[PDB]
Design a protein around this ligand. Structure first.
Ligand SMILES: [Fe+3]
Ligand SMILES: [Fe+3]
Ligand SMILES: [Fe+3]
Lengths: 6, 6, 6, 6, 6, 6, 6, 6, 6, 6, 6, 6
């Protein structure tokens, strides 16, 4: 899936 | 840590 | 469509 | 699971 | 309430 | 820390 | 829709 | 209580 | 802007 | 760190 | 629309 | 890479 780091 | 769109 | 944290 | 519908 | 924990 | 959809 | 930090 | 609109 | 601090 | 909707 | 973390 | 489509 498409993610971003947080 | 990641935020992902599923 | 969900936003999930991992 | 740590998710919300968006 | 419908929440994610970050 | 929590993020909630109202 | 509103998504809020608690 | 700070929010975004989606 | 449509942002929150996390 | 901020989350923005753009 | 997009969710962006900066 | 800061963004994901929603
Ligand atoms: Fe990666
Ligand atoms: Fe990477
Ligand atoms: Fe990457």
């Amino acid at each position: 899936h498409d993610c971003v780091n947080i | 840590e990641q935020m992902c769109i599923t």
